[PDB]
Amino acid sequence: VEYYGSLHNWGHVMMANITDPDHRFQENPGVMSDTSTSLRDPIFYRWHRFIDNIFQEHKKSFHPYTKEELSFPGVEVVGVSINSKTANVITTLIKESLLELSHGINFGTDQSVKVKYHHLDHEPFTYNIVVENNSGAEKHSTVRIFLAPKYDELNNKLEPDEQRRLFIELDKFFYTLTPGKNTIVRNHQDSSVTISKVRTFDQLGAGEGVSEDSTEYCSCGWPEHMLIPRGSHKGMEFELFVMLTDHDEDTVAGLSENAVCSDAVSYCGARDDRYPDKKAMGFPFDRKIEARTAAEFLTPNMGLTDIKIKFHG
Amino acid sequence: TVADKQARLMPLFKHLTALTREKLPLDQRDERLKGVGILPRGTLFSCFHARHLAEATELYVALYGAKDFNDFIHLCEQARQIVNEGMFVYAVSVAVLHREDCKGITVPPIQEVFPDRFVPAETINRANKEASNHPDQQSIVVEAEETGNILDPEYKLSYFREDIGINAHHWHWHIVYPATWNPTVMGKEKDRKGELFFYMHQQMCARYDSERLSNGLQRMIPFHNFDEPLEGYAPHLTSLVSGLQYASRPEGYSIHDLSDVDVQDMVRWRERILDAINMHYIVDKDNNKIPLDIEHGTDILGDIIESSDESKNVEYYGSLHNWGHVMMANITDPDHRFQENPGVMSDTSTSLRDPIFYRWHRFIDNIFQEHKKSFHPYTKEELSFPGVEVVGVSINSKTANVITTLIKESLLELSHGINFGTDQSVKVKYHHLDHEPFTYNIVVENNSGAEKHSTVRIFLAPKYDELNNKLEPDEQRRLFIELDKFFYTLTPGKNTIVRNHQDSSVTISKVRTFDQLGAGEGVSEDSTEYCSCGWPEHMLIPRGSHKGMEFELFVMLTDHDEDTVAGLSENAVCSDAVSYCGARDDRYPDKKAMGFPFDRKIEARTAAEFLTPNMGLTDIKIKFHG
Amino acid sequence: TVADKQARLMPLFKHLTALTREKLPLDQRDERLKGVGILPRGTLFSCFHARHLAEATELYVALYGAKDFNDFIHLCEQARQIVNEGMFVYAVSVAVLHREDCKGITVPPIQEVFPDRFVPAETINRANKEASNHPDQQSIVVEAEETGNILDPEYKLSYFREDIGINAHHWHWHIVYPATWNPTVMGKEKDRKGELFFYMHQQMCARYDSERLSNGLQRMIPFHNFDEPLEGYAPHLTSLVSGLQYASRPEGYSIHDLSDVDVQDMVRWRERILDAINMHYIVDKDNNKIPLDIEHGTDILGDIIESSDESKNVEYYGSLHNWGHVMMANITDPDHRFQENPGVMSDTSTSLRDPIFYRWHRFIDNIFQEHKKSFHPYTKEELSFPGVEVVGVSINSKTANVITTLIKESLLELSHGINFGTDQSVKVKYHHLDHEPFTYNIVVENNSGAEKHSTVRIFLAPKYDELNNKLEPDEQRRLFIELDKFFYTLTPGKNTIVRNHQDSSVTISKVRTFDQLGAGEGVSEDSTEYCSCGWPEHMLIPRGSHKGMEFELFVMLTDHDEDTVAGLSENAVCSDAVSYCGARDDRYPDKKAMGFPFDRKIEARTAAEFLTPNMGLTDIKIKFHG
């Protein structure tokens, strides 16, 4: 503690009492002081790439991945494609919505004081992923699926080491694959990062059985409407990069049945269990890539499917 | 004769630079040029540095005052055998525009005699290197485009700023109006030069201010304070006169005093001016107060701020415009110990690439805007052409109410400017913005039983802010660009006027390469203007965006018998660009201040409130064809 | 055979650069080279941008792993068709110095294949333009001198800094010792490269520190703090590769962070080093503490730091030396959005012109000086060669105890480097400092009945300060330059040794032009040093002043049977510059640290107190022949 500090937390005090560290004049600090307010204020991310830059050094002194290491032997990803309303676009929306102020502040009289807000969302979609399982045995896989951008803010440049900062895991599952041509089809909802249903204070004041665990199970998970970024009205062009690694290799002893934040197993986890996958969260894209395109990095168990996102104005 | 006219000057300018060094054992020959020889050849000419304009005004008065067409040429053979070429071409283009034996003489095209200030250093030494790579008579064509790691947002606007016709127009405007135009010693004067000097520069920077918003950036910020740093820029231009180059500015540099003027006496001039606006008068070099009247005030603020020889006071008002240019361009090196070739603001042909250019030009515009601002807004009375009703406009390109802009790859013949040695032609293929052709269809109810003669002023502004959609017309007056201005006659009742893109009153239509000049045409027979003044055609309507950005086409009809100056001048001629530039030995044909309606204050919150029945906004799209 | 060996490489270097673009549709050919590619041709290489070194390490491992003298050449035909030729020549010169089938192939002279980094842009442009001015086979000679208003004091020292042989030596030293010399994968090692890397650089900057005082200026100030601005300089060099030029630095420029390293990780590295001096050890890439010894410590700190490949720790000690070079040279543009060709510190051939060069080189010297400083001063015991008495020295030039320096105009054949197209030769006449020849006459009383074998280390420092005449020898150790170092044998009694200027152990004598390489002379059959490394002859003794400035010739005699390394190596050969450089595949012949005596602390106040009977100051004058 004395030697390493709490550099993360500590930067938060100083970045948020940026009005008033001495604290003589008693102002309520900048939103970085709490974890619920924190993400609005643009500087938030300036510190979070900073700490990330330290973590990136530690991962950086570790060595890049051997093709050996990257290769799930025998299974060939013959391709992926996404079908929303059309192929290889997803279409994002605005959805107006409510939040019931009544619970928090004193209505005094009325039923409900509602704040109608407006939020980004997305169309549902599927992965259709084709495979040649050359091996006469059925293969059990763990399928790590990612979304990055295909363009830079300079021109279109698929520098994957640069892209590892942008690369987001959209899904991670186990499937079993018979010999030959296999298709897996996987629908948006069942993303391993997300909350699906969350409980209003009302539902709680009544009663349901979804099951009964706590502040993770609904309250945590990344939100559904922010599962795929806005893109642009034109249709911006991104990268859906999949890996298949082995499931008997990847499984931590015991697969969990009960959804207990383990709807969101990726960004968060599952309750009183471990992160189910052997590899570092980020994998493949935790370490250095010496290669200049995400295409060079392709093993036959990896696959980029270039997709569009378009904001419905 | 005026043919062999052409045939002496331009032959001297053929592969121009190298005739700067020649035999002339003793200066004494030209008792006339006695005291000028005071910069050793390529000890590099930085024009805006005060002494070099003064040195050049020796040259302007000398080069004007030649006996007949022949003695003019002899002087030009002779004095050249030792002198600095950039200045020599400058003062002889001023001459062979304006001393009255000249007509039918064309100024050798600056883009083609000095390509270095227009294109990348790479594509110069490349075309060059390909003539060293294959010693053959084959032409060489090089694609100017380059391949870089584009960090900078601003490099986008390098379609507009860095353009051939853009930068040529810029030299040409001040070759047709030199600051050192003394009227008396040169016999006659230069119509409306100060005001026209506000205007042309606002219209440039308003076209630009659109080009900023088209891109989804903000309008360009003015150099209102002197402390505040100047932006960083690399022109990518090495000069063909030697090996060296325009030293290029890093960002984060404050403005620095000069061996001539302190940044503070600059600060004084500005205080001494903006005060005279509040006081509403000026003290000439005799101390007598002449009025900052409504009409005259802008010609007399413009001459003064520049400064011209026509600057009624020089010590007192400075040359604040020019002077800011020295300091903003020698931003590397004012003391000048290090002898670095200055930033591109030092010359009028290079000037528009460098982003800071516009920061100073809104600044001077802000002064002109104060003078117009103390003048009062327009009465509805004043705005109203009685009886004629603009029932509407619409533009038909390929479709209604869109115009569609393009990229057009093009050439510029380096051969004329640099030494090919062997080959035919060394060509730089560049890529420029353009636009589809289009028409105005404008409908009118001429209620009056008499035919009406109008002057139709048509404008383009942006309808969006860079904030949300807000039609604040006083804010929009900075962006507002005059697309056209004509006279039509309107019978009673429903009238339609239809007006095609080409015949815009701001533009050059036909440009003219030196190869044309090697033969000769009859279009007319005029000078440094002819196929080189005028705003360029491809930049007539700004880029917009790929989506289709949404703009404002605002028309006015004012009266033509009111508006036309009466007087006796010439046929239909070099009037093509009458708006941004003018017409020769005539006045600006329209009574009202260049800008009208949009010169003065608007208290109203929408361009719709400002509508008289002889005004009309037609909301149009522009889309960049990717 | 070694004739046709020469007759292939140099024919390819007859108009080199243009070989860079050729038909290689598939790189795949060289599984060797397959991995290189974020540098397409003249997108200009900062030599220090980390990615390109990596790209080049691919090329180093490819280019090495060869068959024989033939397959070597084929690789060199082929990989060249796409690569940044600057890197390719750097690679073929690290190769065709050191891979053992090659003796007697001389490296094509950098001054003559790339003259652009040595001379004024103007005299390149002029010779070029004169071939375009007279298309004839006549040679052209241009006087490099130029003419301009000398505001600046520092332009004086441009006799020394900017010199042909100076700047060539500089590339050549690091072509003979590359930072990326891996020993294991290349079979064998490089004797004393870190220490020798301190030394050669101190000796350069000490010759310079004299040249500052000769002029009546002070010794050059070190870049001890990072905040403090860098001086302004214009090299006047446009590059023959593309249009562009080395963007030139204005003064008042603060250092700036890089996309690679923060100026702070630099401060970190320095702290991590300086503390390890105090602690007296280093942690290699395994974490194990090896001693900061008197013997090994300096080879193992020198690999550590450079950062040589040989390096003991890279992340921990950085490459502080090289890294400072990126930041001091991209002082215009670290972010690199602009694409300006960096300041001359980015390359080893240009480096010495720019005044800031020495500010960093005293800085690194200051670190080395700490390490030597924690080591203890020399015992009189240690300083004493027993029994031999230096009864004195004196120098006889034209007169006693003066040497007289001259100007010598000279040539450099641009033809080899750029395209003459037509003529024989395009010559740049330059003007350089030189000196009269002279001798040492040194008298000795060898008291011992036996003949003594000595090693005689002779030095030149200044006797004056800029304050007054003050012989503070610890201060003088920064200025102290070794003029000579030899072995003689001394009979009993009165001995005289006489030693003529030429045979200085620091120097090149005969330089070799590309033309003589088209024939063949017999000197040694060796490589990138042969006639190109060594310090140049004309800068062997600094300028002094026109008055005759007063300096210090300090001699030591230490023992030769003590000093000579024993081992088995070669005949008399490329040992001419044994001091500043060395000899081939052998060690530095002398036991003691390069600098000796003057490596360590002197507590004493005069160079006279430091006198042992085997030491001797002979106060000499130098006078510049105006």
UniProtKB/Swiss-Prot annotation, chains B, C:
One of its GO terms (molecular function) is oxidoreductase activity. SUPFAM superfamilies: Di-copper centre-containing domain (SSF48056), E set domains (SSF81296), Hemocyanin, N-terminal domain (SSF48050). It comes from Androctonus australis (Sahara scorpion). Belongs to the tyrosinase family. Hemocyanin subfamily. GO terms for cellular component: extracellular region. It holds the Pfam family Hemocyanin_N. The two copper ions bound each have 3 nitrogen ligands (presumably contributed by His residues) and share a bridging ligand (possibly contributed by a Tyr residue) in addition to binding oxygen. Hemocyanins are copper-containing oxygen carriers occurring freely dissolved in the hemolymph of many mollusks and arthropods. It is found in: Secreted, Extracellular space. Three disulfide bonds are present. Scorpion hemocyanin is a 24-chain polymer with 8 different chains identified, assembled in hexameric substructures. The lineage of its organism: Eukaryota, Metazoa, Ecdysozoa, Arthropoda, Chelicerata. Hemolymph. This is Hemocyanin AA6 chain. Keywords: Copper, Disulfide bond, Metal-binding, Oxygen transport, Phosphoprotein, Secreted, Transport. InterPro entries: Di-copper_centre_dom_sf, Hemocyanin/hexamerin, Hemocyanin/hexamerin_mid_dom, Hemocyanin_C, Hemocyanin_C_sf, Hemocyanin_N, Hemocyanin_N_sf, Ig_E-set. Cu cation 1 binds at H170, H174, H201. Cu cation 2 binds at H321, H325, H361. The modification Phosphoserine is found at S374.
